[PDB]
Design a protein around this ligand. Structure first.
Ligand SMILES: [Tb+3]
Ligand SMILES: [Tb+3]
Ligand SMILES: [Tb+3]
Ligand SMILES: [Tb+3]
Ligand SMILES: [Tb+3]
Ligand SMILES: [Tb+3]
Ligand SMILES: [Tb+3]
Ligand SMILES: [Tb+3]
Lengths: 174, 175, 174, 172, 173, 175
C-alpha cells in the first residue's frame, strides 16, 4: 500500500527516519532525567533544571518535526520503546553537561549517517531538510555545551562548590 | 540516609509515584502516536491530530508535575523504559477516541489505587494532591471522550465517511 | 448495560446525589418564598428581598452543579417533586434568617452524610467535589447567617421596628 | 391591602396557579437540559438552549410574583410537580414536548386574560398582553421552526441531523 | 452553652486548633528573631533579614486564618503565652536555614496529627481546610528551605564568608 | 562582644528597649485577641474586628522599628515570652475600647519612663527617636480611643443594642 504522495523516497530512508525519531525522543527523555536531578533537594539548582527542561522540550519538538516529515514524504511511522537513561544519578552540573555533549554528538553522528544515506539514494529534499533544521542546530548545541563544560572546568567544579552555584545564576540565569 | 525534606512519606507511596510517572509518560506517547496517524495523507484529519497533540502535551505536563511532587516530598525518581503503543495503525477517528477512553480509565484507576495507598499510609498531602490536580481532570477527560465517541457513533462513523470529516470541523475545530 | 464513563461510582452514591439535587432545589424554592415575603407592601424590605433572591439563585447553581457531576460520573438523574416551604408568611426579618440558618445546617447535615457515604465506598473524587464546592460554602453561609441573626437580636428586632429597617440599609445594602 | 385596588380574589388565585405553572415549565426545561448533558446523548448546545429557556421561565415566574405584590395580592406557593418523563428520547422529541408545554402555558394565560377581562381589570390585562402573550407566541413559533427543521433533516433516525442542528441553529 | 453555627465540630478538634494557633504564632516570633539577627551590624545581611521578615508575616497570616476558622465552626479561641525562641543568637545564615527547616517540619508534624484527629472524628471540612491551605504550603516551605540549606552547604558556609554574601544577593536578593 | 557602630548608648537604655519591644509585641497580641472576639458569631461586628486588626498590625510595626533602632545603635536584642491577654472574653465593644484606652496609656507611660532614662543618660538620638515616632502617635491613639469610648457611652452601649451596631458602620466602618 504505497502512498499517493510518495515520490523519490526510499524504504531505507523511511526506516532511518523511524530510528532517528526514537533517538530524538530518547534525547528528550535523557534531558528530562537531568532536569529532575537538579530539581532535587540534595542538589538544588533551579536554572540548571530549567536549562535541561528547555532542551527536553526542544528534543520533543525535533522528534515531532521528523514525524511531520515522514507523513509529508508518504512514509509510515512505526514507533519503538524509548529506552531509559544510562544513569539515574547524574553526579554534578559538569558531568551532566559532559554527558549532554556526548549525547548531542551521538545524535549528530546519526544525522550525518542519515544525510549520507539520502545523498547515496539521490534524495535532495531529505538532504535539505536535514541541513536546514538539524545539522545547523546540532553544531550550535554542541558548541554551546562545549562552552559550558569548559567554563565549569576552569571555575573548579565540582570540587569548588561556588563554581556550580555561580554558573547557575550568571550563565544559565533566566 | 533519608532526605532532609522527607516527612510522613512511605517508600511504597514513593514507588507508586515512580510507576505513575511512567504511566503518565506512556499516555503521552500513545496520544503522540494517535496524533501522527491523522496527520497521514491517507487519513488527513487536521483537527483530530491537533486534539491528540494537545492531549499528548497535557499528559507530559501531568508527568512532570508528579516528578516535581516526588522531589518535594524527599522521594527519589527512578525512571523506566516508556513502552510503545499497543498499535501503530489506529484505524479510524472513532476507534482512537475509544482507545483514548480506555486509556484514560486505565490511568484513572491507577490514580484511585494510588489514592487508596495514600489513605492507608495516612498521607493527607498526597491524597489532596491527587484529588486536586488529577482526579478532577481525569473525570472531565473521560466525560469529554465519552461525548466524542457517542457523537461519532450516532453520526454513523466510521462507515459514513462524512461523519468524521464534519466532526473534525465542528467539534474539534470550534465550539 | 452501565455507562461508558462510569468508574468507581456506587449506586448508593448515585441515589444520594439525586436526593441532594432535590434538597438543593428545595432550598432554592424556600429562599424564593422568603424573597417574595419582604417584597410585599406590608413588609417593604427591599434589600432583604434582594438578599434572599441572590441566595435562591446560588442554590439553583448548586443544584445544576450536582446534575453536571451526576452526568460526569455516568450516573442518571431522576428528578422528584420539589416540596413547598413549611410556611408562606415568614413573620419578620429575624425569623427568616433563623429559618435560613436552620435550612443551611440541614443541607450541611445531608452533605456530611453524603461525604460519609462517599468515604465508605472509597470514592475520592466525590469526596473532593463535595469538599471543594459545597462544604466550604455551607460553613461560610452558616457563619454569615449566624452573624445576621445575632445583629438583629441585639439591635432589638422584631420588636424594635427601626432595627430591621436599619439592618436592611447598612448590612444588606452593601 | 393598602395598595390593593380593583383586584378580584379569583384573579389573585389565578396568578398563584400561573406562578406554579411557570415554575413547573422551568423545571421541565431543566430536566431537558440535563438529558443532553448526559454522555449517551452528548449534545452541548441543546443543553445550553433548554438551560437558557429554564432560566427565562424562572424569570417569568419571579415577574408574576412581583405583580402579585404590586396589586396587594398574597402569594401562596404549591409543590412544583416533576416532569412527566426523565428520559426525553431525542432532540426532536424534546422540542415537540417543549412545543406542547408552551401551548399549555399559553392556554392558561389566555384563560387568565379572559378572567381579567371578565372582572374589569385593565392593568392585569395589559400586563399579560405586554410581557407574556407576545413572548409565548414568539416561543411557540421558535419551537415550531426547530421541530420542522429536525423533521425535514430526518431526525432522530438520521444521525447527523441532530448533530448538525446542534451546531448551526442552536450554536450560532 | 453551644454555639448556633456549630455543627459536626468536636471539642478535641476545637482544642487542637487553639494549640495550633499558638504554634503558628510561635513560628512567626521565631522568624522575627531570625530576621533581626541578620539586620545587626556584626552580621549585616539585608536580603536574609527580608527573607525571614516575609516568613514571619506569613506565619502571622496563617495564625489569623486558624482564628477565623475557629469562629466559623462555632469554636471559642483561648489564647496562651507565646514562648520565646530557644536561642537569641542564630550563628549564621546556614544555621538559621537549618533551624527554619527543623521548625517547619515540627509545625507540619502538628498539622498532620491535626488532620488525623479530624479524620478520626469524621470532620471533612476541617480536613479539607488543612489540606488546601496548610499542607500544600508547609511541603512547599520545607522544600524551599531544603534547597537553600543545600546551596549554602555546597558553597562552603559558614567557613567561606563570601558564600553567604553571594547567597544573599543572588538567591534571596 | 562590642559593636563597631555603638556610640553614646548605655546598657540600661539597651535593656529598656528590649522590655519596650516585648511591650509593643504584647500590645499587638492583645489587639489580636480583641479583633477575634468581634469576629465571633455571637458577637458579630465586622468593622470592630477590622479596627483592632489594623491596630494589631500597627503595634507589630512599632515593635519591629524598636528592633531596627536597637541594631542601629549597636545594641543586641534579647527576646522574652509574650504574655497572654488578661481576659479572653472582652464582653462588649465599649469594654474593649476602655481596655484599649488603658493599654495605650500603659504603653505611653513606659515610653515616658524610657525617654526620661534617655534624658538622664544624655542620649539625644534616642530622645528624638521616641519623640518623633512614638510619643506623637500614642497621644493621637489615646485621643482617638477616648473619642470612641465617649460616643459609645452616650449612645447607650452596651445596654442599647443599636448603639454598638450603628457605631460599627458609621465611625469604624468608614474605611
Ligand atoms: Tb536534536
Ligand atoms: Tb493524566
Ligand atoms: Tb481533599
Ligand atoms: Tb447549597
Ligand atoms: Tb412562559
Ligand atoms: Tb392593551
Ligand atoms: Tb505555617
Ligand atoms: Tb505603639
Amino acid at each position: 500500500s504505497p502512498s499517493q504522495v510518495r515520490q523519490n523516497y526510499h524504504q531505507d530512508a523511511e526506516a532511518a527516519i523511524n530510528r532517528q525519531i526514537n533517538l530524538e525522543l530518547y534525547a528528550s527523555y535523557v534531558y528530562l532525567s537531568m532536569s529532575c536531578y537538579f530539581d532535587r533537594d540534595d542538589v538544588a539548582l533551579k536554572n540548571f533544571a530549567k536549562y535541561f527542561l528547555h532542551q527536553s522540550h526542544e528534543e520533543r519538538e525535533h522528534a515531532e518535526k521528523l514525524m511531520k516529515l515522514q507523513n509529508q514524504r508518504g512514509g509510515r511511522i512505526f514507533l519503538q520503546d524509548i529506552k531509559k537513561p544510562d544513569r539515574d544519578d547524574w553526579e554534578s552540573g559538569l558531568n551532566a553537561m559532559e554527558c549532554a555533549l556526548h549525547l548531542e554528538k551521538s545524535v549528530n553522528q546519526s544525522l550525518l549517517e542519515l544525510h549520507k544515506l539520502a545523498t547515496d539514494k539521490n534524495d535532495p529534499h531529505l538532504c535539505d531538510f536535514i541541513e536546514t533544521y538539524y545539522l545547523s542546530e546540532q553544531v550550535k548545541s554542541i558548541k554551546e555545551l562545549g562552552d559550558h563544560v569548559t567554563n565549569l572546568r576552569k571555575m573548579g567544579a565540582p570540587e569548588a562548590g561556588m563554581a556550580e552555584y555561580l554558573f547557575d545564576k550568571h550563565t544559565l540565569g533566566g
